[PDB]
Amino acid sequence: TYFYGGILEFVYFDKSNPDMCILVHTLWIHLLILFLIFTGFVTILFSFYG
Amino acid sequence: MKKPMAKAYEHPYNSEHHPLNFSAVKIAETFHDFI
């Protein structure tokens, strides 16, 4: 610290260590949601069955 | 009365739920099953 460090500063040390879980099924759910949105786009504007 | 034929030809790749050929009629049925 004396030779190669900076000033000694007081901070609050967070003991909780957050981390986003890199999962697989979260993208499956995300695709399912976009699939509902795209199907609704087709259902309203590209449905010619009536 | 003459005995008729047992059956005609049965296509091995055409079904009512998976029709081989495409048209808007089958898409209409799958659409109204969805909504």
Side-chain angles (χ1 to χ4, degrees):
Chain A
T1 300
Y2 178 80
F3 287 117
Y4 317 115
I7 312 174
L8 290 178
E9 302 175 345
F10 283 91
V11 301
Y12 291 129
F13 184 72
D14 194 2
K15 291 299 186 61
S16 57
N17 293 255
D19 187 21
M20 299 305 299
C21 198
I22 300 95
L23 293 174
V24 175
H25 66 93
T26 52
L27 189 49
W28 291 342
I29 270 69
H30 181 63
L31 291 177
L32 177 65
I33 297 183
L34 299 181
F35 182 53
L36 168 63
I37 297 180
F38 181 76
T39 304
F41 180 70
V42 176
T43 306
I44 300 303
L45 297 177
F46 295 92
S47 60
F48 317 109
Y49 325 108
Chain B
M1 175 185 177
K2 295 178 55 181
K3 182 181 179 185
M5 292 185 54
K7 57 177 295 181
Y9 185 76
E10 180 175 354
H11 199 271
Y13 295 99
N14 190 36
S15 62
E16 186 179 353
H17 184 57
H18 294 274
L20 181 58
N21 296 320
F22 298 91
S23 62
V25 186
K26 184 56 183 180
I27 307 181
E29 172 182 51
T30 58
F31 176 70
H32 283 98
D33 296 3
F34 160 56
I35 59 171

Coordinates of all heavy atoms in Angstrom, one line a residue:
Chain A
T1 N 0.8 -1.2 0.0 CA 0.0 0.0 0.0 C 0.9 1.3 0.0 O 0.5 2.2 -0.7 CB -0.9 0.0 1.2 OG1 -1.8 -1.2 1.2 CG2 -1.8 1.2 1.2
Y2 N 2.0 1.2 0.7 CA 2.8 2.4 0.8 C 3.5 2.7 -0.5 O 3.6 3.9 -0.9 CB 3.8 2.2 2.0 CG 4.8 3.4 2.1 CD1 4.4 4.6 2.8 CD2 6.0 3.4 1.5 CE1 5.2 5.6 2.9 CE2 6.9 4.5 1.6 CZ 6.5 5.6 2.3 OH 7.3 6.7 2.4
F3 N 4.0 1.7 -1.1 CA 4.8 1.9 -2.4 C 3.9 1.9 -3.6 O 4.1 2.7 -4.5 CB 5.9 0.8 -2.5 CG 7.0 1.0 -1.5 CD1 7.3 0.1 -0.6 CD2 7.8 2.1 -1.6 CE1 8.3 0.2 0.3 CE2 8.9 2.3 -0.7 CZ 9.1 1.3 0.2
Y4 N 3.0 0.9 -3.7 CA 2.3 0.7 -5.0 C 0.8 0.8 -4.8 O 0.0 0.4 -5.7 CB 2.6 -0.7 -5.5 CG 4.1 -1.0 -5.5 CD1 4.5 -2.1 -4.7 CD2 5.0 -0.3 -6.2 CE1 5.8 -2.4 -4.6 CE2 6.3 -0.7 -6.2 CZ 6.7 -1.7 -5.4 OH 8.1 -2.0 -5.4
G5 N 0.3 1.4 -3.7 CA -1.1 1.5 -3.5 C -1.6 2.9 -3.4 O -0.8 3.9 -3.5
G6 N -2.9 3.1 -3.3 CA -3.5 4.4 -3.2 C -3.9 4.7 -1.7 O -3.4 4.0 -0.8
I7 N -4.7 5.7 -1.5 CA -5.1 6.1 -0.2 C -6.0 5.0 0.4 O -6.8 4.4 -0.3 CB -5.8 7.5 -0.2 CG1 -5.0 8.5 -1.0 CG2 -6.0 8.0 1.2 CD1 -5.7 9.8 -1.2
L8 N -5.9 4.8 1.7 CA -6.7 3.9 2.5 C -8.1 4.6 2.7 O -8.2 5.5 3.4 CB -6.1 3.6 3.8 CG -4.8 2.7 3.7 CD1 -4.3 2.4 5.1 CD2 -5.2 1.4 3.1
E9 N -9.1 4.1 2.0 CA -10.4 4.6 2.0 C -11.4 3.7 2.7 O -11.3 2.4 2.5 CB -10.9 5.0 0.6 CG -10.0 5.9 -0.2 CD -10.5 6.1 -1.6 OE1 -11.3 5.3 -2.1 OE2 -10.0 7.1 -2.2
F10 N -12.4 4.2 3.4 CA -13.4 3.4 4.1 C -14.6 3.2 3.2 O -15.2 4.2 2.7 CB -13.8 4.1 5.4 CG -12.8 4.0 6.5 CD1 -11.8 5.0 6.7 CD2 -12.9 2.9 7.4 CE1 -10.9 4.8 7.7 CE2 -12.0 2.8 8.4 CZ -11.0 3.8 8.6
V11 N -14.9 1.9 2.9 CA -16.0 1.6 2.2 C -16.8 0.5 2.9 O -16.3 0.0 3.9 CB -15.7 1.0 0.8 CG1 -14.9 2.1 0.0 CG2 -14.9 -0.2 0.9
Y12 N -18.0 0.2 2.5 CA -18.9 -0.8 3.1 C -18.7 -2.0 2.2 O -19.0 -2.0 1.0 CB -20.3 -0.3 3.1 CG -20.5 0.8 4.2 CD1 -21.2 2.0 3.8 CD2 -20.0 0.7 5.4 CE1 -21.3 3.0 4.7 CE2 -20.2 1.7 6.4 CZ -20.9 2.8 6.0 OH -21.0 3.8 6.9
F13 N -18.3 -3.1 2.8 CA -18.1 -4.4 2.2 C -19.3 -5.3 2.1 O -19.7 -5.8 3.1 CB -16.9 -5.1 2.9 CG -16.5 -6.4 2.2 CD1 -15.8 -6.4 1.1 CD2 -16.8 -7.6 2.8 CE1 -15.4 -7.5 0.5 CE2 -16.4 -8.8 2.2 CZ -15.7 -8.7 1.1
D14 N -19.9 -5.4 0.9 CA -21.1 -6.1 0.8 C -20.8 -7.6 0.9 O -20.0 -8.2 0.1 CB -21.8 -5.8 -0.6 CG -23.2 -6.3 -0.7 OD1 -23.7 -6.9 0.3 OD2 -23.8 -6.2 -1.8
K15 N -21.4 -8.3 1.9 CA -21.2 -9.7 2.0 C -22.1 -10.5 1.1 O -21.7 -11.7 0.7 CB -21.6 -10.1 3.5 CG -20.7 -9.6 4.5 CD -19.2 -10.1 4.3 CE -18.4 -9.8 5.5 NZ -18.9 -10.4 6.8
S16 N -23.2 -10.0 0.6 CA -24.0 -10.7 -0.4 C -23.4 -10.5 -1.8 O -23.1 -9.4 -2.2 CB -25.4 -10.1 -0.4 OG -25.4 -8.7 -0.6
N17 N -23.1 -11.6 -2.4 CA -22.5 -11.6 -3.7 C -23.5 -12.0 -4.8 O -23.7 -13.2 -5.1 CB -21.3 -12.6 -3.7 CG -20.2 -12.1 -2.8 OD1 -19.1 -11.6 -3.3 ND2 -20.4 -12.2 -1.5
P18 N -24.1 -11.1 -5.5 CA -25.1 -11.4 -6.5 C -24.4 -12.0 -7.7 O -23.2 -11.7 -8.0 CB -25.7 -10.1 -6.8 CG -24.7 -9.1 -6.4 CD -24.0 -9.6 -5.3
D19 N -25.1 -12.8 -8.5 CA -24.6 -13.4 -9.7 C -25.8 -13.9 -10.5 O -26.6 -14.7 -10.0 CB -23.7 -14.5 -9.4 CG -23.0 -15.1 -10.6 OD1 -23.0 -14.4 -11.6 OD2 -22.5 -16.3 -10.6
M20 N -25.9 -13.5 -11.7 CA -27.0 -13.9 -12.6 C -26.7 -15.3 -13.0 O -25.7 -15.7 -13.6 CB -27.1 -13.0 -13.8 CG -27.4 -11.6 -13.5 SD -28.9 -11.4 -12.4 CE -30.1 -12.0 -13.6
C21 N -27.7 -16.2 -12.8 CA -27.6 -17.6 -13.1 C -27.7 -17.8 -14.6 O -28.8 -17.5 -15.2 CB -28.6 -18.5 -12.4 SG -28.2 -20.2 -12.3
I22 N -26.7 -18.3 -15.3 CA -26.7 -18.5 -16.7 C -27.4 -19.9 -16.9 O -26.8 -20.9 -16.8 CB -25.4 -18.5 -17.4 CG1 -24.7 -17.1 -17.2 CG2 -25.5 -18.8 -18.9 CD1 -23.8 -17.1 -16.0
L23 N -28.7 -19.8 -17.3 CA -29.5 -21.0 -17.4 C -29.9 -21.3 -18.8 O -29.6 -20.5 -19.7 CB -30.8 -20.9 -16.5 CG -30.5 -20.9 -15.0 CD1 -31.7 -20.6 -14.2 CD2 -29.9 -22.2 -14.5
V24 N -30.5 -22.5 -19.0 CA -31.0 -22.9 -20.4 C -32.5 -22.7 -20.5 O -32.9 -22.2 -21.6 CB -30.6 -24.4 -20.6 CG1 -31.1 -24.9 -21.9 CG2 -29.1 -24.5 -20.5
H25 N -33.3 -23.1 -19.6 CA -34.7 -23.0 -19.7 C -35.2 -21.6 -19.7 O -36.4 -21.3 -20.1 CB -35.4 -23.8 -18.6 CG -35.2 -23.3 -17.2 ND1 -36.1 -22.4 -16.6 CD2 -34.2 -23.4 -16.3 CE1 -35.6 -22.1 -15.4 NE2 -34.5 -22.7 -15.2
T26 N -34.5 -20.6 -19.2 CA -34.9 -19.2 -19.3 C -35.0 -18.7 -20.7 O -35.9 -17.9 -21.0 CB -34.0 -18.3 -18.5 OG1 -32.6 -18.5 -18.9 CG2 -34.1 -18.6 -17.0
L27 N -34.2 -19.2 -21.6 CA -34.3 -18.8 -23.0 C -35.5 -19.5 -23.7 O -36.1 -19.0 -24.6 CB -33.0 -19.1 -23.8 CG -32.9 -18.5 -25.2 CD1 -33.3 -17.1 -25.3 CD2 -31.5 -18.7 -25.7
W28 N -35.8 -20.7 -23.2 CA -36.9 -21.4 -23.7 C -38.2 -20.7 -23.4 O -39.1 -20.5 -24.2 CB -37.0 -22.8 -23.1 CG -35.9 -23.8 -23.6 CD1 -35.2 -23.6 -24.7 CD2 -35.5 -25.0 -23.0 NE1 -34.3 -24.7 -24.8 CE2 -34.5 -25.5 -23.8 CE3 -35.9 -25.7 -21.9 CZ2 -33.9 -26.7 -23.5 CZ3 -35.3 -26.9 -21.6 CH2 -34.3 -27.4 -22.4
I29 N -38.3 -20.2 -22.1 CA -39.5 -19.4 -21.7 C -39.5 -18.1 -22.5 O -40.6 -17.6 -23.0 CB -39.5 -19.2 -20.2 CG1 -40.2 -20.3 -19.5 CG2 -40.1 -17.8 -19.9 CD1 -39.5 -21.6 -19.5
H30 N -38.3 -17.5 -22.7 CA -38.3 -16.2 -23.5 C -38.7 -16.4 -24.9 O -39.4 -15.6 -25.5 CB -36.9 -15.7 -23.4 CG -36.7 -14.4 -24.2 ND1 -37.3 -13.2 -23.8 CD2 -36.0 -14.1 -25.2 CE1 -37.0 -12.3 -24.6 NE2 -36.2 -12.7 -25.5
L31 N -38.4 -17.5 -25.5 CA -38.8 -17.8 -26.9 C -40.3 -18.1 -26.9 O -41.0 -17.7 -27.9 CB -38.1 -19.0 -27.4 CG -36.6 -18.8 -27.8 CD1 -36.0 -20.1 -28.2 CD2 -36.5 -17.8 -28.8
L32 N -40.9 -18.7 -25.9 CA -42.3 -19.0 -25.8 C -43.1 -17.7 -25.7 O -44.2 -17.6 -26.3 CB -42.6 -19.9 -24.6 CG -44.1 -20.2 -24.3 CD1 -44.6 -21.1 -25.5 CD2 -44.1 -20.9 -23.0
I33 N -42.5 -16.7 -25.0 CA -43.2 -15.4 -24.9 C -43.2 -14.6 -26.2 O -44.2 -14.1 -26.6 CB -42.6 -14.6 -23.8 CG1 -42.7 -15.3 -22.4 CG2 -43.1 -13.2 -23.7 CD1 -42.2 -14.6 -21.3
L34 N -42.0 -14.6 -26.9 CA -42.0 -14.0 -28.2 C -42.8 -14.7 -29.2 O -43.3 -14.1 -30.2 CB -40.5 -13.9 -28.6 CG -39.6 -13.1 -27.7 CD1 -38.2 -13.1 -28.3 CD2 -40.1 -11.7 -27.5
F35 N -43.0 -16.0 -29.1 CA -43.8 -16.8 -30.0 C -45.3 -16.5 -29.8 O -46.0 -16.5 -30.8 CB -43.6 -18.3 -29.7 CG -44.4 -19.2 -30.6 CD1 -44.3 -19.1 -32.0 CD2 -45.1 -20.2 -30.1 CE1 -45.0 -19.9 -32.8 CE2 -45.8 -21.1 -30.9 CZ -45.8 -20.9 -32.2
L36 N -45.7 -16.1 -28.6 CA -47.1 -15.7 -28.4 C -47.3 -14.3 -29.0 O -48.3 -14.0 -29.6 CB -47.4 -15.7 -26.9 CG -48.7 -14.9 -26.4 CD1 -49.9 -15.6 -27.0 CD2 -48.8 -14.9 -24.9
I37 N -46.3 -13.4 -28.9 CA -46.4 -12.1 -29.5 C -46.4 -12.2 -31.0 O -47.1 -11.4 -31.6 CB -45.2 -11.2 -29.0 CG1 -45.3 -11.1 -27.4 CG2 -45.2 -9.9 -29.6 CD1 -44.2 -10.3 -26.8
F38 N -45.5 -13.0 -31.6 CA -45.5 -13.1 -33.0 C -46.8 -13.8 -33.6 O -47.3 -13.4 -34.6 CB -44.3 -13.9 -33.5 CG -44.2 -14.0 -35.0 CD1 -43.8 -13.0 -35.7 CD2 -44.5 -15.2 -35.6 CE1 -43.7 -13.1 -37.1 CE2 -44.4 -15.3 -36.9 CZ -44.0 -14.3 -37.7
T39 N -47.3 -14.8 -32.8 CA -48.5 -15.4 -33.2 C -49.7 -14.5 -33.2 O -50.6 -14.5 -34.0 CB -48.8 -16.7 -32.4 OG1 -47.7 -17.5 -32.5 CG2 -50.0 -17.4 -32.9
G40 N -49.7 -13.6 -32.1 CA -50.8 -12.6 -32.1 C -50.7 -11.6 -33.2 O -51.7 -11.1 -33.7
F41 N -49.4 -11.3 -33.7 CA -49.2 -10.5 -34.8 C -49.8 -11.2 -36.1 O -50.4 -10.5 -36.9 CB -47.8 -10.2 -35.0 CG -47.4 -9.3 -36.2 CD1 -47.8 -8.0 -36.2 CD2 -46.7 -9.8 -37.2 CE1 -47.4 -7.2 -37.3 CE2 -46.4 -9.1 -38.3 CZ -46.7 -7.7 -38.3
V42 N -49.6 -12.5 -36.2 CA -50.2 -13.2 -37.3 C -51.7 -13.4 -37.1 O -52.4 -13.3 -38.1 CB -49.5 -14.6 -37.4 CG1 -50.1 -15.4 -38.5 CG2 -48.0 -14.4 -37.7
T43 N -52.1 -13.6 -35.9 CA -53.5 -13.9 -35.7 C -54.4 -12.7 -36.0 O -55.6 -12.9 -36.5 CB -53.8 -14.2 -34.2 OG1 -52.9 -15.3 -33.8 CG2 -55.2 -14.6 -33.9
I44 N -53.9 -11.5 -35.8 CA -54.7 -10.3 -36.1 C -54.6 -9.8 -37.5 O -55.5 -9.4 -38.1 CB -54.3 -9.2 -35.1 CG1 -54.5 -9.7 -33.6 CG2 -55.0 -7.9 -35.3 CD1 -56.0 -10.1 -33.4
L45 N -53.3 -9.8 -38.0 CA -53.1 -9.2 -39.3 C -52.8 -10.1 -40.5 O -52.8 -9.7 -41.6 CB -51.8 -8.3 -39.2 CG -52.0 -7.1 -38.2 CD1 -50.7 -6.4 -38.1 CD2 -53.1 -6.2 -38.6
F46 N -52.6 -11.4 -40.2 CA -52.4 -12.4 -41.3 C -53.2 -13.6 -41.1 O -52.7 -14.7 -41.3 CB -50.9 -12.7 -41.3 CG -50.0 -11.5 -41.7 CD1 -49.5 -10.7 -40.8 CD2 -49.8 -11.2 -43.1 CE1 -48.7 -9.6 -41.2 CE2 -49.0 -10.2 -43.4 CZ -48.5 -9.3 -42.5
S47 N -54.4 -13.5 -40.6 CA -55.3 -14.6 -40.5 C -56.5 -14.3 -41.4 O -57.2 -13.3 -41.3 CB -55.8 -14.7 -39.0 OG -56.5 -13.6 -38.6
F48 N -56.7 -15.2 -42.4 CA -57.7 -15.1 -43.4 C -58.6 -16.3 -43.4 O -58.9 -16.9 -44.4 CB -57.0 -14.9 -44.8 CG -55.9 -14.0 -44.7 CD1 -54.6 -14.5 -44.9 CD2 -56.0 -12.6 -44.6 CE1 -53.5 -13.7 -44.9 CE2 -54.9 -11.8 -44.5 CZ -53.7 -12.3 -44.7
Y49 N -59.1 -16.7 -42.2 CA -59.9 -17.9 -42.0 C -61.2 -17.5 -41.3 O -61.3 -17.5 -40.1 CB -59.1 -18.9 -41.2 CG -57.6 -18.9 -41.6 CD1 -56.7 -18.4 -40.7 CD2 -57.2 -19.3 -42.8 CE1 -55.4 -18.3 -41.0 CE2 -55.8 -19.2 -43.1 CZ -54.9 -18.7 -42.2 OH -53.6 -18.7 -42.5
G50 N -62.2 -17.1 -42.1 CA -63.4 -16.6 -41.6 C -64.3 -16.2 -42.7 O -64.4 -16.9 -43.7
Chain B
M1 N -76.4 -60.0 -55.4 CA -75.5 -58.9 -55.3 C -74.0 -59.4 -55.3 O -73.7 -60.2 -54.5 CB -75.7 -58.0 -54.1 CG -74.7 -56.9 -53.8 SD -75.0 -56.1 -52.2 CE -73.6 -55.0 -52.2
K2 N -73.2 -58.9 -56.3 CA -71.8 -59.3 -56.4 C -71.1 -58.8 -55.2 O -71.3 -57.7 -54.6 CB -71.2 -58.8 -57.6 CG -71.8 -59.3 -58.9 CD -71.2 -58.7 -60.2 CE -69.7 -58.8 -60.2 NZ -69.1 -58.2 -61.4
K3 N -70.1 -59.6 -54.7 CA -69.3 -59.2 -53.6 C -68.4 -58.1 -54.0 O -67.5 -58.2 -55.0 CB -68.4 -60.4 -53.2 CG -67.5 -60.1 -52.0 CD -66.7 -61.4 -51.6 CE -65.8 -61.1 -50.4 NZ -64.9 -62.2 -50.1
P4 N -68.4 -56.9 -53.4 CA -67.6 -55.8 -53.8 C -66.2 -56.0 -53.4 O -65.8 -56.9 -52.7 CB -68.3 -54.6 -53.1 CG -68.9 -55.2 -51.9 CD -69.3 -56.5 -52.3
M5 N -65.3 -55.0 -53.8 CA -63.9 -55.1 -53.4 C -63.7 -54.8 -51.9 O -64.5 -54.1 -51.3 CB -63.1 -54.1 -54.2 CG -63.0 -54.5 -55.7 SD -61.9 -53.4 -56.6 CE -60.4 -53.5 -55.7
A6 N -62.7 -55.4 -51.3 CA -62.5 -55.2 -49.9 C -62.1 -53.8 -49.5 O -62.7 -53.2 -48.6 CB -61.4 -56.2 -49.4
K7 N -61.2 -53.2 -50.3 CA -60.7 -51.8 -50.0 C -60.0 -51.3 -51.2 O -59.5 -52.1 -52.1 CB -59.8 -51.8 -48.8 CG -58.6 -52.7 -48.9 CD -57.7 -52.6 -47.7 CE -57.0 -51.2 -47.6 NZ -56.1 -51.2 -46.5
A8 N -59.9 -50.0 -51.3 CA -59.1 -49.3 -52.3 C -57.7 -49.1 -51.8 O -57.3 -49.6 -50.7 CB -59.8 -48.0 -52.7
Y9 N -56.9 -48.3 -52.5 CA -55.6 -48.1 -52.1 C -55.6 -47.1 -50.9 O -56.4 -46.2 -50.8 CB -54.8 -47.4 -53.3 CG -53.3 -47.2 -53.0 CD1 -52.4 -48.3 -53.0 CD2 -52.8 -45.9 -52.8 CE1 -51.1 -48.1 -52.8 CE2 -51.5 -45.7 -52.5 CZ -50.6 -46.8 -52.5 OH -49.3 -46.6 -52.3
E10 N -54.7 -47.4 -50.0 CA -54.5 -46.5 -48.8 C -53.1 -45.9 -48.9 O -52.1 -46.6 -48.9 CB -54.6 -47.3 -47.6 CG -54.4 -46.5 -46.3 CD -54.7 -47.3 -45.0 OE1 -55.1 -48.5 -45.1 OE2 -54.5 -46.8 -43.9
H11 N -53.1 -44.6 -49.1 CA -51.8 -43.9 -49.2 C -51.0 -43.9 -47.9 O -51.6 -43.6 -46.8 CB -52.0 -42.4 -49.6 CG -50.9 -41.8 -50.2 ND1 -49.9 -41.1 -49.5 CD2 -50.5 -41.7 -51.5 CE1 -49.0 -40.6 -50.3 NE2 -49.3 -40.9 -51.5
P12 N -49.7 -44.4 -47.9 CA -49.0 -44.5 -46.7 C -48.5 -43.2 -46.1 O -47.8 -43.2 -45.0 CB -47.8 -45.4 -47.1 CG -47.6 -45.1 -48.6 CD -49.0 -44.8 -49.1
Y13 N -48.7 -42.1 -46.7 CA -48.2 -40.8 -46.3 C -49.2 -39.7 -46.2 O -48.9 -38.5 -46.3 CB -47.0 -40.3 -47.1 CG -45.8 -41.3 -47.0 CD1 -45.5 -42.2 -48.0 CD2 -44.9 -41.2 -46.0 CE1 -44.4 -43.0 -47.9 CE2 -43.8 -42.0 -45.9 CZ -43.6 -42.9 -46.8 OH -42.5 -43.7 -46.8
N14 N -50.5 -40.0 -46.2 CA -51.6 -39.1 -46.1 C -52.5 -39.5 -45.0 O -53.0 -40.6 -45.0 CB -52.4 -39.0 -47.4 CG -53.3 -37.8 -47.4 OD1 -53.0 -36.7 -46.9 ND2 -54.5 -38.0 -48.0
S15 N -52.7 -38.5 -44.0 CA -53.6 -38.7 -42.9 C -54.5 -37.5 -42.8 O -54.2 -36.5 -43.4 CB -52.8 -39.0 -41.6 OG -52.0 -37.9 -41.3
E16 N -55.5 -37.6 -42.0 CA -56.4 -36.5 -41.8 C -55.8 -35.4 -40.9 O -56.1 -34.3 -41.2 CB -57.7 -37.1 -41.2 CG -58.8 -36.0 -41.1 CD -60.1 -36.6 -40.5 OE1 -60.2 -37.8 -40.3 OE2 -61.1 -35.8 -40.3
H17 N -55.0 -35.8 -39.9 CA -54.4 -34.8 -39.1 C -53.1 -34.3 -39.7 O -52.8 -33.1 -39.5 CB -54.1 -35.4 -37.7 CG -53.5 -34.4 -36.7 ND1 -54.2 -33.3 -36.4 CD2 -52.3 -34.4 -36.1 CE1 -53.4 -32.6 -35.5 NE2 -52.3 -33.3 -35.3
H18 N -52.4 -35.1 -40.5 CA -51.2 -34.6 -41.2 C -51.5 -34.8 -42.7 O -50.9 -35.8 -43.3 CB -50.0 -35.4 -40.8 CG -49.6 -35.2 -39.4 ND1 -48.8 -34.1 -39.0 CD2 -49.8 -35.9 -38.3 CE1 -48.5 -34.2 -37.7 NE2 -49.2 -35.2 -37.2
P19 N -52.3 -33.9 -43.3 CA -52.5 -34.1 -44.8 C -51.2 -33.8 -45.6 O -50.4 -32.9 -45.2 CB -53.6 -33.0 -45.1 CG -53.5 -32.1 -44.0 CD -53.0 -32.8 -42.8
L20 N -51.0 -34.6 -46.6 CA -49.8 -34.4 -47.4 C -49.7 -33.1 -48.1 O -48.7 -32.4 -48.1 CB -49.7 -35.6 -48.4 CG -48.5 -35.7 -49.3 CD1 -47.2 -35.7 -48.4 CD2 -48.6 -36.9 -50.2
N21 N -50.8 -32.7 -48.8 CA -50.8 -31.5 -49.6 C -51.3 -30.4 -48.7 O -52.0 -30.5 -47.7 CB -51.7 -31.7 -50.8 CG -51.1 -32.7 -51.8 OD1 -49.9 -32.8 -52.0 ND2 -52.0 -33.6 -52.3
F22 N -51.0 -29.2 -49.2 CA -51.3 -27.9 -48.4 C -52.4 -27.1 -49.0 O -52.5 -27.0 -50.2 CB -50.0 -27.1 -48.3 CG -48.9 -27.8 -47.6 CD1 -48.0 -28.5 -48.3 CD2 -48.8 -27.6 -46.2 CE1 -46.9 -29.1 -47.6 CE2 -47.7 -28.2 -45.6 CZ -46.8 -29.0 -46.3
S23 N -53.2 -26.5 -48.1 CA -54.2 -25.5 -48.5 C -54.5 -24.7 -47.3 O -54.2 -25.0 -46.2 CB -55.4 -26.3 -49.1 OG -56.0 -27.1 -48.1
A24 N -55.3 -23.6 -47.6 CA -55.7 -22.7 -46.5 C -56.8 -23.3 -45.7 O -57.1 -22.8 -44.6 CB -56.2 -21.4 -47.1
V25 N -57.4 -24.4 -46.1 CA -58.5 -25.0 -45.4 C -58.0 -25.7 -44.1 O -58.6 -25.6 -43.0 CB -59.3 -26.0 -46.3 CG1 -60.5 -26.6 -45.5 CG2 -59.7 -25.4 -47.6
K26 N -56.9 -26.5 -44.3 CA -56.3 -27.1 -43.1 C -55.7 -26.1 -42.1 O -55.8 -26.3 -40.9 CB -55.3 -28.1 -43.6 CG -54.7 -29.0 -42.4 CD -55.8 -29.7 -41.7 CE -55.2 -30.5 -40.5 NZ -56.3 -31.2 -39.8
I27 N -55.1 -25.0 -42.7 CA -54.6 -24.0 -41.8 C -55.8 -23.3 -41.1 O -55.6 -22.9 -39.9 CB -53.8 -23.0 -42.6 CG1 -52.7 -23.7 -43.4 CG2 -53.2 -22.0 -41.7 CD1 -51.9 -22.8 -44.2
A28 N -57.0 -23.2 -41.7 CA -58.1 -22.6 -41.1 C -58.6 -23.5 -39.9 O -59.0 -22.9 -38.8 CB -59.2 -22.4 -42.1
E29 N -58.6 -24.8 -40.0 CA -59.0 -25.7 -39.0 C -58.0 -25.6 -37.8 O -58.4 -25.6 -36.6 CB -59.1 -27.1 -39.5 CG -59.3 -28.2 -38.4 CD -59.4 -29.6 -39.0 OE1 -58.5 -29.9 -39.8 OE2 -60.4 -30.3 -38.7
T30 N -56.7 -25.6 -38.1 CA -55.7 -25.5 -37.0 C -55.8 -24.2 -36.3 O -55.5 -24.0 -35.1 CB -54.3 -25.8 -37.5 OG1 -54.0 -24.8 -38.5 CG2 -54.2 -27.2 -38.1
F31 N -56.2 -23.1 -37.1 CA -56.3 -21.8 -36.5 C -57.4 -21.7 -35.5 O -57.3 -21.2 -34.4 CB -56.4 -20.8 -37.6 CG -56.7 -19.4 -37.1 CD1 -55.6 -18.7 -36.5 CD2 -57.9 -18.8 -37.3 CE1 -55.8 -17.4 -36.1 CE2 -58.1 -17.5 -36.8 CZ -57.1 -16.8 -36.2
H32 N -58.6 -22.2 -35.9 CA -59.8 -22.1 -35.0 C -59.7 -23.1 -33.9 O -60.4 -22.9 -32.8 CB -61.1 -22.3 -35.8 CG -61.5 -21.2 -36.6 ND1 -61.2 -21.0 -38.0 CD2 -62.1 -20.0 -36.3 CE1 -61.6 -19.9 -38.4 NE2 -62.2 -19.2 -37.4
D33 N -58.9 -24.1 -34.0 CA -58.6 -24.9 -32.8 C -57.8 -24.2 -31.8 O -57.9 -24.4 -30.6 CB -57.9 -26.2 -33.2 CG -58.8 -27.1 -34.1 OD1 -59.9 -26.7 -34.4 OD2 -58.3 -28.2 -34.4
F34 N -56.9 -23.3 -32.3 CA -56.0 -22.5 -31.4 C -56.8 -21.4 -30.7 O -56.8 -21.3 -29.5 CB -54.9 -21.9 -32.2 CG -54.2 -20.8 -31.6 CD1 -53.7 -20.8 -30.3 CD2 -54.1 -19.6 -32.3 CE1 -53.1 -19.8 -29.8 CE2 -53.5 -18.5 -31.7 CZ -53.0 -18.6 -30.5
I35 N -57.5 -20.5 -31.5 CA -58.2 -19.4 -30.8 C -59.5 -20.0 -30.2 O -60.2 -19.2 -29.4 CB -58.6 -18.3 -31.8 CG1 -59.4 -18.9 -33.0 CG2 -57.4 -17.7 -32.3 CD1 -60.0 -17.9 -33.9

